[PDB]
Design an enzyme around this catalytic site. Structure first.
Site, PDB file in Angstrom:
ATOM      1  CG  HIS A 111       7.891  44.825 -43.921  1.00 23.86           C
ATOM      2  ND1 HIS A 111       7.337  44.011 -42.954  1.00 23.86           N
ATOM      3  CD2 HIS A 111       9.207  44.934 -43.604  1.00 23.86           C
ATOM      4  CE1 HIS A 111       8.267  43.674 -42.071  1.00 23.86           C
ATOM      5  NE2 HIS A 111       9.412  44.222 -42.437  1.00 23.86           N
ATOM      6  N   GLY A 167       8.937  38.064 -35.935  1.00 26.37           N
ATOM      7  CA  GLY A 167       8.229  39.074 -35.175  1.00 26.37           C
ATOM      8  C   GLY A 167       9.100  40.145 -34.541  1.00 26.37           C
ATOM      9  CB  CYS A 186       9.728  43.415 -38.310  1.00 23.23           C
ATOM     10  SG  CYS A 186      10.477  42.465 -39.545  1.00 23.23           S
TER      11      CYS A 186
END
Length: 301
Positions: A41, A143, A145
Protein backbone atom coordinates in the site's frame (compact mmCIF):
# COMPACT_ATOMS: atom_id res chain seq x y z
CA UNK A 1 16.29 -13.65 39.32
CA UNK A 2 13.57 -11.34 38.04
CA UNK A 3 11.24 -11.57 35.07
CA UNK A 4 10.64 -8.94 32.44
CA UNK A 5 9.12 -8.80 29.00
CA UNK A 6 12.39 -9.32 27.22
CA UNK A 7 12.96 -8.66 23.55
CA UNK A 8 15.72 -10.06 21.36
CA UNK A 9 18.73 -7.85 20.73
CA UNK A 10 17.83 -5.89 17.66
CA UNK A 11 21.16 -5.07 15.97
CA UNK A 12 20.84 -7.64 13.21
CA UNK A 13 17.45 -6.24 12.16
CA UNK A 14 18.41 -2.59 12.62
CA UNK A 15 20.99 -2.97 9.82
CA UNK A 16 18.23 -4.00 7.42
CA UNK A 17 15.82 -1.13 7.93
CA UNK A 18 15.43 1.38 5.07
CA UNK A 19 13.01 4.11 4.03
CA UNK A 20 10.77 3.59 0.99
CA UNK A 21 9.00 6.56 -0.59
CA UNK A 22 6.45 6.53 -3.42
CA UNK A 23 4.42 9.64 -4.23
CA UNK A 24 3.96 11.43 -0.94
CA UNK A 25 3.74 8.10 0.95
CA UNK A 26 6.81 7.19 3.04
CA UNK A 27 7.27 4.04 5.19
CA UNK A 28 9.73 1.39 6.17
CA UNK A 29 11.28 -1.42 4.21
CA UNK A 30 13.46 -4.41 5.01
CA UNK A 31 16.61 -4.75 2.93
CA UNK A 32 17.93 -8.29 2.64
CA UNK A 33 20.54 -9.16 0.00
CA UNK A 34 19.46 -7.12 -3.04
CA UNK A 35 15.71 -6.98 -2.28
CA UNK A 36 13.68 -4.41 -0.28
CA UNK A 37 10.36 -5.68 1.16
CA UNK A 38 7.58 -3.28 2.10
CA UNK A 39 3.79 -3.05 2.34
CA UNK A 40 2.33 -2.79 -1.15
CA UNK A 41 0.00 0.00 0.00
CA UNK A 42 3.01 2.30 -0.34
CA UNK A 43 1.82 2.68 -3.95
CA UNK A 44 -1.57 3.93 -2.90
CA UNK A 45 -2.98 7.44 -2.77
CA UNK A 46 -5.56 8.60 -0.26
CA UNK A 47 -8.32 8.97 -2.86
CA UNK A 48 -7.83 5.38 -4.12
CA UNK A 49 -7.71 3.74 -0.73
CA UNK A 50 -11.33 2.60 -0.46
CA UNK A 51 -11.12 -0.02 -3.23
CA UNK A 52 -7.65 -0.18 -4.84
CA UNK A 53 -6.61 -2.54 -7.63
CA UNK A 54 -2.96 -3.04 -6.76
CA UNK A 55 -2.15 -4.81 -10.00
CA UNK A 56 -3.33 -1.73 -11.95
CA UNK A 57 -1.66 0.65 -9.54
CA UNK A 58 1.63 -1.22 -9.82
CA UNK A 59 1.66 -1.59 -13.62
CA UNK A 60 1.55 2.24 -13.81
CA UNK A 61 4.76 2.62 -11.80
CA UNK A 62 8.39 2.70 -12.92
CA UNK A 63 11.50 1.73 -10.94
CA UNK A 64 12.23 5.48 -10.57
CA UNK A 65 8.93 6.09 -8.79
CA UNK A 66 10.42 4.36 -5.70
CA UNK A 67 12.95 6.29 -3.60
CA UNK A 68 14.87 3.89 -1.36
CA UNK A 69 17.10 5.37 1.35
CA UNK A 70 19.41 3.32 3.50
CA UNK A 71 20.57 5.93 5.95
CA UNK A 72 22.14 8.52 3.68
CA UNK A 73 22.82 6.24 0.72
CA UNK A 74 20.17 6.18 -1.95
CA UNK A 75 19.61 2.71 -3.38
CA UNK A 76 18.92 2.48 -7.06
CA UNK A 77 15.86 0.32 -7.74
CA UNK A 78 16.45 -1.96 -10.72
CA UNK A 79 13.16 -3.87 -10.60
CA UNK A 80 9.87 -4.30 -8.77
CA UNK A 81 7.23 -6.98 -8.26
CA UNK A 82 4.28 -7.81 -6.02
CA UNK A 83 4.03 -10.87 -3.75
CA UNK A 84 0.60 -10.98 -2.11
CA UNK A 85 0.45 -7.86 0.07
CA UNK A 86 4.18 -7.01 0.03
CA UNK A 87 6.21 -5.33 -2.67
CA UNK A 88 9.66 -6.67 -3.55
CA UNK A 89 11.98 -3.87 -4.77
CA UNK A 90 15.05 -5.18 -6.54
CA UNK A 91 18.05 -2.89 -5.91
CA UNK A 92 21.54 -2.80 -7.34
CA UNK A 93 23.42 -3.39 -4.05
CA UNK A 94 23.31 -6.42 -1.79
CA UNK A 95 22.95 -5.33 1.84
CA UNK A 96 26.41 -5.97 3.34
CA UNK A 97 24.75 -6.37 6.72
CA UNK A 98 22.25 -9.07 5.70
CA UNK A 99 22.15 -11.51 8.61
CA UNK A 100 21.43 -15.15 8.27
CA UNK A 101 17.65 -15.17 8.04
CA UNK A 102 14.44 -17.08 7.38
CA UNK A 103 10.84 -16.11 6.68
CA UNK A 104 8.62 -18.06 9.05
CA UNK A 105 4.94 -17.72 9.80
CA UNK A 106 4.01 -17.82 13.45
CA UNK A 107 0.96 -19.26 15.30
CA UNK A 108 -1.41 -17.43 17.59
CA UNK A 109 -0.04 -17.55 21.06
CA UNK A 110 3.62 -17.35 19.94
CA UNK A 111 5.72 -14.29 20.76
CA UNK A 112 8.15 -12.16 18.82
CA UNK A 113 10.15 -8.97 19.07
CA UNK A 114 9.04 -5.84 17.18
CA UNK A 115 11.51 -3.20 16.01
CA UNK A 116 9.36 -0.09 15.66
CA UNK A 117 10.75 2.10 12.88
CA UNK A 118 9.96 5.54 11.47
CA UNK A 119 11.36 6.87 8.15
CA UNK A 120 13.68 3.91 8.01
CA UNK A 121 15.10 4.65 11.47
CA UNK A 122 14.54 2.33 14.47
CA UNK A 123 12.70 3.90 17.44
CA UNK A 124 12.38 1.06 19.97
CA UNK A 125 12.13 -2.67 20.52
CA UNK A 126 9.52 -4.63 22.42
CA UNK A 127 8.16 -8.12 22.85
CA UNK A 128 4.81 -9.00 21.31
CA UNK A 129 2.48 -11.96 21.10
CA UNK A 130 0.24 -12.95 18.21
CA UNK A 131 -3.29 -12.92 19.75
CA UNK A 132 -5.73 -15.80 19.09
CA UNK A 133 -7.67 -13.42 16.90
CA UNK A 134 -4.56 -12.71 14.71
CA UNK A 135 -4.03 -9.16 15.86
CA UNK A 136 -1.18 -7.87 17.92
CA UNK A 137 -1.32 -5.30 20.71
CA UNK A 138 1.56 -3.27 19.43
CA UNK A 139 2.76 0.25 19.98
CA UNK A 140 2.75 1.99 16.59
CA UNK A 141 2.38 5.59 15.43
CA UNK A 142 1.83 7.08 11.97
CA UNK A 143 4.61 5.96 9.65
CA UNK A 144 5.44 2.68 11.37
CA UNK A 145 4.16 0.64 8.41
CA UNK A 146 6.82 -1.80 7.31
CA UNK A 147 8.35 -2.30 10.78
CA UNK A 148 9.04 -6.00 11.29
CA UNK A 149 8.60 -8.58 14.03
CA UNK A 150 11.15 -11.34 14.49
CA UNK A 151 12.73 -14.08 16.56
CA UNK A 152 16.43 -14.89 16.84
CA UNK A 153 17.90 -18.35 17.22
CA UNK A 154 21.61 -19.16 17.04
CA UNK A 155 22.53 -16.14 14.84
CA UNK A 156 19.60 -16.67 12.47
CA UNK A 157 16.78 -14.14 12.32
CA UNK A 158 13.33 -15.64 11.68
CA UNK A 159 11.19 -12.76 10.37
CA UNK A 160 7.52 -13.39 11.09
CA UNK A 161 5.68 -10.08 10.78
CA UNK A 162 5.53 -6.84 8.83
CA UNK A 163 3.22 -4.09 10.09
CA UNK A 164 0.45 -2.89 7.79
CA UNK A 165 -2.38 -1.12 9.66
CA UNK A 166 -4.22 -0.17 12.84
CA UNK A 167 -7.74 -1.52 13.39
CA UNK A 168 -10.46 0.43 15.19
CA UNK A 169 -9.76 -0.89 18.69
CA UNK A 170 -6.17 0.39 18.40
CA UNK A 171 -4.72 -3.12 17.87
CA UNK A 172 -2.62 -3.93 14.85
CA UNK A 173 -2.63 -6.13 11.79
CA UNK A 174 0.03 -7.24 9.39
CA UNK A 175 1.33 -10.05 7.27
CA UNK A 176 4.21 -12.48 7.16
CA UNK A 177 7.27 -11.82 5.00
CA UNK A 178 5.61 -13.56 2.05
CA UNK A 179 2.83 -10.94 2.18
CA UNK A 180 0.00 -13.11 3.55
CA UNK A 181 -2.13 -11.43 6.24
CA UNK A 182 -2.43 -12.80 9.72
CA UNK A 183 -6.16 -13.11 10.16
CA UNK A 184 -9.09 -11.98 7.98
CA UNK A 185 -7.73 -8.50 7.29
CA UNK A 186 -7.16 -6.78 3.98
CA UNK A 187 -5.13 -3.79 2.87
CA UNK A 188 -8.05 -1.54 1.96
CA UNK A 189 -10.56 0.68 3.79
CA UNK A 190 -13.46 -1.50 5.01
CA UNK A 191 -15.46 -1.95 8.18
CA UNK A 192 -13.09 -4.77 9.19
CA UNK A 193 -12.63 -5.23 12.95
CA UNK A 194 -10.76 -7.57 15.28
CA UNK A 195 -12.81 -10.61 16.17
CA UNK A 196 -13.34 -11.76 19.73
CA UNK A 197 -10.15 -12.80 21.50
CA UNK A 198 -9.32 -15.38 24.18
CA UNK A 199 -6.55 -15.68 26.77
CA UNK A 200 -3.64 -17.97 25.88
CA UNK A 201 -3.95 -20.59 28.65
CA UNK A 202 -0.68 -22.44 28.09
CA UNK A 203 1.20 -19.09 28.38
CA UNK A 204 -0.56 -18.19 31.61
CA UNK A 205 0.56 -21.56 33.04
CA UNK A 206 4.10 -21.04 31.79
CA UNK A 207 4.09 -17.68 33.50
CA UNK A 208 2.91 -19.21 36.79
CA UNK A 209 5.86 -21.59 36.52
CA UNK A 210 8.18 -18.63 36.03
CA UNK A 211 6.76 -17.13 39.21
CA UNK A 212 7.33 -20.30 41.21
CA UNK A 213 10.90 -20.39 39.82
CA UNK A 214 11.29 -16.85 41.16
CA UNK A 215 9.83 -17.46 44.66
CA UNK A 216 6.16 -16.44 44.23
CA UNK A 217 4.34 -19.41 45.77
CA UNK A 218 1.24 -17.94 47.40
CA UNK A 219 -1.21 -19.16 44.72
CA UNK A 220 -0.11 -22.78 44.94
CA UNK A 221 -2.40 -25.36 46.57
CA UNK A 222 -2.48 -29.08 47.34
CA UNK A 223 -5.33 -29.73 44.92
CA UNK A 224 -5.20 -31.22 41.47
CA UNK A 225 -7.76 -31.20 38.69
CA UNK A 226 -8.39 -33.24 35.58
CA UNK A 227 -7.68 -31.72 32.22
CA UNK A 228 -11.43 -32.06 31.45
CA UNK A 229 -12.67 -30.14 34.49
CA UNK A 230 -9.96 -27.50 34.12
CA UNK A 231 -11.11 -26.88 30.52
CA UNK A 232 -14.68 -26.66 31.80
CA UNK A 233 -13.60 -23.70 33.94
CA UNK A 234 -11.33 -22.29 31.20
CA UNK A 235 -14.04 -22.15 28.58
CA UNK A 236 -16.15 -20.07 31.05
CA UNK A 237 -13.47 -17.40 31.60
CA UNK A 238 -12.70 -17.00 27.87
CA UNK A 239 -9.45 -19.00 28.09
CA UNK A 240 -8.27 -21.30 25.34
CA UNK A 241 -8.56 -25.05 25.95
CA UNK A 242 -5.55 -26.91 27.30
CA UNK A 243 -4.32 -30.03 25.51
CA UNK A 244 -2.04 -32.92 26.24
CA UNK A 245 0.51 -31.31 23.92
CA UNK A 246 0.32 -28.17 26.04
CA UNK A 247 0.90 -30.36 29.12
CA UNK A 248 3.83 -32.07 27.44
CA UNK A 249 5.38 -28.69 26.52
CA UNK A 250 4.93 -27.60 30.12
CA UNK A 251 6.84 -30.73 31.17
CA UNK A 252 10.32 -29.20 31.56
CA UNK A 253 8.91 -26.43 33.77
CA UNK A 254 6.80 -28.83 35.84
CA UNK A 255 9.83 -31.05 36.41
CA UNK A 256 12.13 -28.15 37.25
CA UNK A 257 9.69 -26.90 39.92
CA UNK A 258 8.16 -30.19 41.04
CA UNK A 259 4.60 -28.97 40.45
CA UNK A 260 2.69 -31.22 38.09
CA UNK A 261 0.91 -29.44 35.26
CA UNK A 262 -2.53 -30.44 36.49
CA UNK A 263 -1.65 -29.14 39.96
CA UNK A 264 -0.76 -25.73 38.53
CA UNK A 265 -4.07 -25.90 36.71
CA UNK A 266 -5.80 -26.25 40.04
CA UNK A 267 -4.02 -23.02 40.99
CA UNK A 268 -5.15 -21.25 37.84
CA UNK A 269 -8.73 -22.42 38.39
CA UNK A 270 -8.65 -20.89 41.85
CA UNK A 271 -7.17 -17.63 40.59
CA UNK A 272 -9.87 -17.30 37.95
CA UNK A 273 -12.57 -18.00 40.50
CA UNK A 274 -11.39 -15.66 43.27
CA UNK A 275 -8.94 -13.13 41.93
CA UNK A 276 -5.70 -12.38 43.70
CA UNK A 277 -7.20 -10.72 46.79
CA UNK A 278 -4.81 -7.76 46.50
CA UNK A 279 -1.63 -9.77 45.87
CA UNK A 280 0.59 -9.79 42.79
CA UNK A 281 2.54 -12.39 40.80
CA UNK A 282 5.81 -11.37 39.19
CA UNK A 283 4.85 -7.72 39.62
CA UNK A 284 1.43 -8.01 37.94
CA UNK A 285 -2.08 -7.82 39.37
CA UNK A 286 -3.51 -9.84 36.48
CA UNK A 287 -2.77 -13.11 34.68
CA UNK A 288 -0.12 -12.56 32.01
CA UNK A 289 -0.49 -14.51 28.80
CA UNK A 290 2.21 -13.18 26.48
CA UNK A 291 5.02 -15.46 27.71
CA UNK A 292 5.44 -18.85 26.00
CA UNK A 293 7.00 -21.90 27.67
CA UNK A 294 10.10 -21.18 25.55
CA UNK A 295 10.22 -17.59 26.81
CA UNK A 296 10.12 -18.66 30.44
CA UNK A 297 12.79 -21.32 29.93
CA UNK A 298 15.05 -18.78 28.24
CA UNK A 299 14.80 -16.22 31.05
CA UNK A 300 14.51 -18.59 34.01
CA UNK A 301 15.73 -22.17 34.37
Amino acid sequence: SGFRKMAFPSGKVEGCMVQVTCGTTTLNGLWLDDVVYCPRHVICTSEDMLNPNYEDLLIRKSNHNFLVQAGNVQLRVIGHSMQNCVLKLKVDTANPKTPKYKFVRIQPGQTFSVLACYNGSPSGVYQCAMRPNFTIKGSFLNGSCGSVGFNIDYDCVSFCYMHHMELPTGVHAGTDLEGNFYGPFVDRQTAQAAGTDTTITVNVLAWLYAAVINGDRWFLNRFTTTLNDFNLVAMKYNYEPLTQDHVDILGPLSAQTGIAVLDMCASLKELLQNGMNGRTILGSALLEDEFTPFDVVRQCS
